[PDB]
Amino acid sequence: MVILGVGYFLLGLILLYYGSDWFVLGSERIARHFNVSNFVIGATVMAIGTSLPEILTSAYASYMHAPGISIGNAIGSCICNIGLVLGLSAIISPIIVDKNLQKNILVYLLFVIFAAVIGIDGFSWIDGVVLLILFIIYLRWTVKNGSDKNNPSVVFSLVLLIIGLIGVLVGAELFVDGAKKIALALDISDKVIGFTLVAFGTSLPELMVSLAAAKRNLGGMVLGNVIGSNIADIGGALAVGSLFMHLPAENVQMAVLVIMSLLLYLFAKYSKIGRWQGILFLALYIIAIASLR
Ligand SMILES: [Ca+2]
């Protein structure tokens, strides 16, 4: 079970490589038909596509009585998205943000701040419902604010979007499956490896898709996907997980997240999310994962 591990591994990379590229092309075309910006389609359709493994993970974790995991993995992804994902994407393709996109980003900053404030004592099922509503309020607002019978072109767009999404979701669980077989053959029979490599497996569709878009200089789409995913992780993953059990409090991760969200706001308004900014986001990401033990 070693060449099978590599076989699963390399196959996963193939389904993640092309899958994310099709998911981006499908999304870009869909945005053109629904007559919305690359940002809007990234903060809604794309976000929910890549943020689904994060919602299902949190909800299940809190279901089987592991709440500290459900929240720790919920916020840890938001930081991973601004730190690793956005950071890497900005180095590849610097992001100049439009002026109609900043109202959206400001809303994101406030929503994160709102989550941090009510998340000091912890997270009730009350907080969950509140945040769950705000999520939907955000979605219908993002689509509306920035805005057919038998069309062969639209169909092709949906094929790219659906096959592309199936590709990255399958490729991610082939990535993990293969890496686990390799790790086992390597001597790593520890248990945090069975949550570290899987936590990375949930952020893997998000990382790949954002990189695929970054390669095609879709800075707006990249930004939308980061913004949308974090809200889907907080307004959705963090919220749904709180319906089962009372999630604990992490006022050090939330603090860091607000900082990275604040920096994102300032960069996407008075400057840009370019290469040096991305380096900083990466720097803040590595002085975090090391200083948070
Ligand atoms: Ca509370």
Experimental method: X-ray
State the Cα–Cα distance between residues 127 and 242, nearest whole angstrom: 8
CA of 257 to the centre of ligand 1 (A): 18
CA of 138 to the centre of ligand 1 (A): 21
> Which letter, b or e, does each residue of 110-123 get, where b requires 16 or more Cβ atoms within 10 Å of its Cβ?
ebbebbbeebeebb
State the Cα–Cα distance between residues 112 and 227, nearest whole angstrom: 10
Q: Boundaries of CATH 1.20.1420.30 in the chain?
A: 36-147+190-293
CA of 110 to the centre of ligand 1 (A): 17
Contact in structure between 237 and 55 (CB atoms under 8 Å):
yes
Contact in structure between 47 and 229 (CB atoms under 8 Å):
yes
CA of 258 to the centre of ligand 1 (A): 18
CA of 123 to the centre of ligand 1 (A): 4
Dihedral angle over CA of 121, 123, 129, 132, nearest 10 = 110
CA of 117 to the centre of ligand 1 (A): 8
What does the angle CA 60 – CA 186 – CA 58 come to, to the nearest 5 degrees? 10
What does the angle CA 156 – CA 205 – CA 135 come to, to the nearest 5 degrees? 85
> Which letter, b or e, does each residue of 19-32 get, where b requires 16 or more Cβ atoms within 10 Å of its Cβ?
bbbbbbbbbbbbbe
Q: Boundaries of CATH 6.10.280.80 in the chain?
A: 1-35+148-189
State the Cα–Cα distance between residues 251 and 257, nearest whole angstrom: 10
Spatial CA neighbour of 125 closest among 238, 38, 49:
238
144 - beta bridge partners?
A: none
What does the angle CA 89 – CA 183 – CA 288 come to, to the nearest 5 degrees? 40
Query: Among 3.40.50.620, 3.40.50.150, 3.40.50.720, 1.20.1420.30, what is the CATH number of 36-147+190-293?
Result: 1.20.1420.30
Contact in structure between 43 and 224 (CB atoms under 8 Å):
yes
* H-assigned helices in 34-124: 38-41, 47-50, 52-63, 67-80, 86-92, 102-117
State the Cα–Cα distance between residues 188 and 182, nearest whole angstrom: 9
CA of 45 to the centre of ligand 1 (A): 29
Which amino acid would we find at residue 41?
Answer: I
What is the experimental resolution, given in Å to one decimal place?
Answer: 2.8
CA of 14 to the centre of ligand 1 (A): 43
State the Cα–Cα distance between residues 156 and 228, nearest whole angstrom: 25
State the Cα–Cα distance between residues 6 and 165, nearest whole angstrom: 23
CA of 249 to the centre of ligand 1 (A): 9
Spatial CA neighbour of 85 closest among 252, 282, 274:
282
160, containing H or E segment: helix 152-186
Dihedral angle over CA of 91, 286, 47, 255, nearest 10 = -120
CA of 127 to the centre of ligand 1 (A): 6
CA of 266 to the centre of ligand 1 (A): 28
CA of 120 to the centre of ligand 1 (A): 7
The single-letter DSSP state of residue 232 is I
CA of 247 to the centre of ligand 1 (A): 9
Burial of 125 (0-12, 13-18, 19+ CB in 10 A): middle
At the second CATH level, the architecture of 1-35+148-189 is Helix non-globular (6.10)
Q: Is 256 left (phi over 0), alpha (psi -120 to 50) or beta?
A: alpha
203, containing H or E segment: helix 193-215
Q: Which residues contact 211 (CB under 8 A, 6 or more apart)?
A: 20, 85, 88, 89, 92
CA of 289 to the centre of ligand 1 (A): 26
State the Cα–Cα distance between residues 210 and 218, nearest whole angstrom: 9
